[PDB]
Design a protein around this ligand. Structure first.
Ligand SMILES: Cc1cc2c3c(c1C)C(C)(C)C[C@@H](O)N3c1c(nc(O)[nH]c1=O)N2C[C@H](O)[C@H](O)[C@H](O)COP(=O)(O)O
Ligand SMILES: Cc1cc2c3c(c1C)C(C)(C)C[C@@H](O)N3c1c(nc(O)[nH]c1=O)N2C[C@H](O)[C@H](O)[C@H](O)COP(=O)(O)O
Ligand SMILES: [K+]
Ligand SMILES: [K+]
Ligand SMILES: [K+]
Ligand SMILES: [K+]
Ligand SMILES: [Mn+2]
Ligand SMILES: [Mn+2]
Lengths: 500, 500
């Protein structure tokens, strides 16, 4: 099966890329596996595959860390991510995000049901597993539980059957047959749960599939629109219908090649302790446990020699930056264009801990609007900060055409030099805030409201007659033929490879 | 003579360091020398010494570019700067700034007058030079003149004789015997000029010395206090009295080993066109000429085989970042401590284009103050933004003890995650602004007022009971003995030098 359609094949691809380290000696899931993965993420090293996990029994489980993290070279920086999508490993971020957006103007390709698959090779009923006896990792020393769920996909369906959502949300082991996790507004798992709670009749049928098709986990991490079934979006993206097998204990469908599947219910009544967890902004608040959603597990099915993917998330750079930030930015780009805003590109700079999105403006179009900074900031912020795609983002930075928003040095330069603090910004206090950011949930103000800003790094003539400066840089301050002369004589004169 | 006391010796030191490239074939001062230097600065390469400058006659002049720019390795990143000060080339930024601050609590060591020096080896009177016939560089393609003065020191004295100031301010050739340049408030060259204009009787006696003692050019770039003679501060810093020779045509004193000296007057009445110039924030606005101060040159004296230092300034990283930003930050650190604020460290992040200063707070001291963010922000901003040392800085970022302010990734992380936009900030509109920043002089508001902010990236418990989080990073999320195990087994398992 192709790498983008089968996780097992994706792991092969990483090896074949010289982007895997297989570790075949015993590794402890209590902190050691996650510490190694954390180091990998902080240094852009090869992904670790832990083939000999202390506590692995009857096939459950090996771990792959850092599945969506960065490579060290500039030339294939995003290669892991490209390998989720059948793109060349040298793909740019623009190309990856365009691929993720491509299905937005296509007919869905609904999934195909097949009678069996590798995820049915082994099973454990409700008398044969205990989630506390599996080698679930402790990912950070202060975590409030062992977070089994950092890179699987939750599957839930609206009561009427018309929408089946796939998404990533964290969850940890509560006891032998339950998890607790985040289920928070405005996320689709929360929106579907609320539909079942209003109906009031039963718990939510649920599945959690680990080691799903890579193209599916990327859509799971993206805020595609309300009511859109991720399976059909992924089908259209990839050009092929995804093969799914029915769960044994409910009527949900899971990818046929899933490594591990949990089947059960998400309660409409019960909660349990959840967190704290070392999180995407780089923090953990030891002891900050709160009540979360509660999941009951009735069945486990799994591939022979099952592999659990794991995100050891925190400070730069891991899946919570490369996928949450970039995929939100992608959706925000499209949302702005559909609202007739002249945005060409969007990216969440890593340097902002993916709390900012930089929006590149087509300033010829802006000039034809005959508008001002106050009016345009307000219009952009109203569109983005009132939408779910803007949930995680607290600062929007508007930049003109000369800025590559995929280069954080250039975004920082523009922000620092073109946006006058206060005057060139509009604060938004009456929008939904992202409580996970420390300055929100652990800060001085309301955890769930406000704290957002549009920072205009467009210069005044970009609204009127056009850019009126040149950069004081090698590229812009010197004629072409001089520049080329310098470059051609560089090593000759005495001064100091693209792939590397 | 030691490198820190004699520019010629400093050039030797750079060679001996393998930090120089001598270029002995002809190089054009029209753009080529500056383009090569710009490339060096953008890549942290070796400093260029142009020994064969097209237009060099009778010893005037060779050029050294990038005298205070960065080296490529992390281990001696600041080595050029260390070589200005007799510090080891591996000195940290903290050590460099401490050296620059050391004289603030010492008695001055006044300069020593000597009868002659190398700067008297050659002379040109007022019938024998023409500034338009010297190989003055055109530094950026759109500059409004040839900027002879990018790394020399202006020398002016108060009418009463009690204060002699040394400072860097840009100047360009106006005609055969005049320069024009910036002389703007609150700079000391401007403050002294205003004293002569109020007296109204003559033009200001003036000298401009190029290739001065390196320790002197660093104090020239630092906002030491009003009324303090830089020569005596440098004397105390270095532990030795600087040797100075009288000018021939006025009673000012110049460093004995200066490479090139201009003697003349700074007018109290006349102006002339000045600028535009590619500047420290990375911009030039083609055609934005304004009236500047006008200098008359009556005499040139110079060393045999004179060398002119040059800053090809603009986008990162050059002298305008390493010296202006860092030395302002140093003075701001001291200013805050003298106002009883619990600041331990300050640095202007390069990523902010040296428009921000991050202030590290001693949070045990802050807790004993029993204060709040609003009150503390206001107090810090009032101290800094009302003082000349804060002139160039538009954003102050307060951070706690866990942040290394000399590491821009950590400042960015703290700012992005700990400061709630709006709520955790105080805007300052009734302070002097720095018009050079594009969003000020070319922006939407008053060029000379406002646009400043204090951003509090202290978390709430840092004011009360103490830090209540741990970072989700390798360092803080894992015990010591696990961390060391990981490191010790790193290359063994399969994963990937300090000097490099
Ligand atoms: C890639 C990725 C995404 C997420 C998460 C993680 C990873 C690796 C964890 C490591 C597990 C950490 C956790 O904070 N986490 C997470 C989460 N969204 C939440 O509601 N809850 C979460 O606990 N998202 C983000 C969501 O996946 C996206 O916001 C997506 O858009 C949701 O799908 P939908 O609601 O739009 O269908
Ligand atoms: C290191 C350095 C410093 C400065 C400059 C440059 C360099 C390389 C130029 C390349 C020439 C560019 C120019 O923008 N420039 C410059 C300038 N200050 C100005 O009033 N005018 C200027 O044109 N400073 C900063 C000042 O040197 C400091 O603010 C210093 O504090 C002043 O001394 P004082 O007034 O405190 O005695
Ligand atoms: K999704
Ligand atoms: K602006
Ligand atoms: K000075
Ligand atoms: K704060
Ligand atoms: Mn969805
Ligand atoms: Mn001074």
């Amino acid at each position: 099966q192709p790498a983008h359609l089968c996780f097992r094949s994706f792991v092969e691809a990483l090896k074949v890329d010289n982007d895997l380290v297989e570790i075949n000696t015993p590794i402890d899931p209590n902190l050691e596996a996650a510490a190694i993965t954390r180091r990998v993420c902080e240094t852009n090293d090869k992904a670790p595959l832990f083939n000999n996990l202390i506590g692995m029994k009857n096939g459950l489980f090996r771990i792959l860390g850092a599945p969506g993290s960065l490579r060290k070279s500039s030339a294939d920086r995003y290669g892991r991510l490209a390998r989720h999508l059948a793109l060349p490993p040298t793909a740019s971020m623009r190309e990856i995000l365009d691929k993720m957006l491509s299905a937005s103007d296509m007919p869905p390709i609904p999934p195909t049901i097949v009678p069996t698959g590798p995820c049915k090779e082994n099973s454990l009923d409700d008398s044969e597993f205990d989630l506390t006896e599996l080698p679930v990792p402790l990912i950070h020393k202060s975590d409030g539980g062992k977070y089994i769920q950092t890179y699987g996909m939750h599957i839930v369906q609206s009561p009427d059957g018309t929408w089946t959502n796939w998404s990533i949300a964290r969850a940890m082991v509560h006891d032998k047959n339950h998890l607790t996790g985040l289920v928070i507004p405005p996320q689709h798992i929360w929106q579907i749960h609320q539909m079942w709670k209003k109906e009031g009749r039963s718990d939510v049928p649920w599945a959690l599939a680990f080691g799903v098709p890579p193209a599916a986990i990327m859509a799971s991490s993206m805020p595609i629109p309300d009511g859109v079934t991720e399976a059909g979006y992924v089908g259209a993206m990839t050009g092929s219908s995804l093969e799914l097998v029915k769960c044994d204990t409910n009527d949900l469908y899971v990818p046929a090649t899933s490594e591990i599947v949990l089947e059960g219910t998400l309660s409409i009544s019960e909660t349990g302790p959840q967190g704290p967890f070392g999180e995407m902004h780089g923090y953990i608040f030891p002891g900050d446990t709160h009540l979360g959603a509660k999941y009951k597990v009735n069945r486990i099915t799994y591939r022979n020699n099952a592999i659990m993917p794991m995100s050891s998330c925190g400070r730069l750079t891991d899946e919570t930056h490369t996928m949450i930030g970039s995929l939100a930015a992608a959706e925000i780009r499209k949302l702005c264009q559909q609202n007739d805003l002249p945005i060409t590109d969007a990216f969440a700079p890593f340097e902002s801990q993916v709390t900012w999105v930089a929006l590149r403006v087509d300033t010829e179009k802006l000039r034809a609007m005959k508008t001002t900074s106050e009016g345009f900031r307000k219009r952009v912020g109203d569109v983005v900060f009132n939408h779910k795609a803007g949930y995680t983002i607290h600062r929007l930075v508007l930049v003109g055409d000369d800025i590559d928003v995929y280069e954080g040095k250039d975004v920082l330069w523009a922000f620092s030099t073109r946006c006058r603090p206060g005057m060139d910004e509009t604060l938004f206090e009456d929008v939904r805030g992202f409580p996970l950011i420390p300055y929100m949930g652990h800060g001085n103000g309301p955890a769930h409201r406000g704290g957002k800003v549009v920072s205009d790094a467009l210069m005044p003539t970009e609204y009127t007659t056009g850019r009126n400066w040149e950069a004081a840089d090698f590229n812009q301050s010197y004629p072409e033929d001089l520049k080329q002369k310098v470059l051609d004589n560089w090593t000759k004169m005495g001064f100091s490879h693209h792939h590397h």
